[PDB]
Amino acid sequence: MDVSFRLSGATSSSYGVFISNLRKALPNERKLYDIPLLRSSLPGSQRYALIHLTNYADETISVAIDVTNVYIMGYRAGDTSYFFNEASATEAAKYVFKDAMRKVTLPYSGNYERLQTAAGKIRENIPLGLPALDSAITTLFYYNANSAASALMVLIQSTSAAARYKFIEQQIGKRVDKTFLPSLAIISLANSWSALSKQIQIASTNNGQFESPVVLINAQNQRVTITNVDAGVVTSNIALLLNRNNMA
Numbered sequence: 217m218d219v220s221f222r223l224s225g226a227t228s229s230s231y232g233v234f235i236s237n238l239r240k241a242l243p244n245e246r247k248l249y250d251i252p253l254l255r256s257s258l259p260g261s262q263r264y265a266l267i268h269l270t271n272y273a274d275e276t277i278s279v280a281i282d283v284t285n286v287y288i289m290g291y292r293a294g295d296t297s298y299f300f301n302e303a304s305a306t307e308a309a310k311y312v313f314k315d316a317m318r319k320v321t322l323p324y325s326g327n328y329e330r331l332q333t334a335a336g337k338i339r340e341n342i343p344l345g346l347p348a349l350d351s352a353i354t355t356l357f358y359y360n361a362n363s364a365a366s367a368l369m370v371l372i373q374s375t376s377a378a379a380r381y382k383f384i385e386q387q388i389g390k391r392v393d394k395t396f397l398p399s400l401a402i403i404s405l406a407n408s409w410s411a412l413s414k415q416i417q418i419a420s421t422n423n424g425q426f427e428s429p430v431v432l433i434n435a436q437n438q439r440v441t442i443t444n445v446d447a448g449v450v451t452s453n454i455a456l457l458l459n460r461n462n463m464a
């Protein structure tokens with residue numbers, strides 16, 4: 217099921233609607249502690265969804281995600297598709313954007329370490345917020361090799377990461393007419409998503425206790441060691457769980 221967000225006329229509330237809609241597009245059979253557990257595996261015909269994004273200037277891209285893990289596989293602009301250079305995206309390309317005339321395989325996977333190398337910049341120095349998503353859409357719609365990695369990191373954080381964590385949703389959406397640099401809390405949450413997901417699943421079998429702690433950096437910049445499901449990150453932040461059988 218497809219989802220969309222339009223930057224023209226956007227508000228913090230319409231972004232909230234977009235992120236709720238994105239979360240709702242992701243299949244789950246169960247919740248653990250009131251958090252959706254994503255599917256471990258889906259047939260090809262069920263595995264992908266499109267996010268349609270339109271910038272201030274009415275230019276649109278379509279972004280393919282794997283709905284088992286929220287990972288961006290690639291995007292389409294007009295008659296050209298762009299996929300990450302990795303196994304998952306190669307498989308996605310058999311299912312989405314099939315009638316694109318030209319297909320570009322980007323020179324990196326969609327892994328953050330690869331992207332930052334490619335961008336020449338770390339996440340903390342790349343602006344986010346709604347106007348940043350507008351610029352990322354423009355940058356990718358008129359693809360330019362030297363600018364695309366930074367734009368894809370804005371895209372990832374503005375969609376996937378926001379869907380995974382209410383904190384990230386709220387921080388991005390608040391910036392309607394301005395931009396901001398993500399705090400270490402945003403970096404830390406994004407870094408730890410797989411690990412936190414794994415530990416919450418283990419917790420379900422271990423009376424709410426993690427088997428291994430997750431070190432996070434909180435909104436006050438304190439470094440914290442999280443050990444169970446009564447932690448605020450679990451009660452009041454994470455919004456999706458990566459299935460333990462879809463990690464490695």
Ligand SMILES: Nc1ncnc2[nH]cnc12
Pocket residue numbers: 286287288289326327328372376377
């Ligand atoms: N390509 C991607 N899509 C979603 N989340 C990600 N985190 C890092 N890379 C990602």
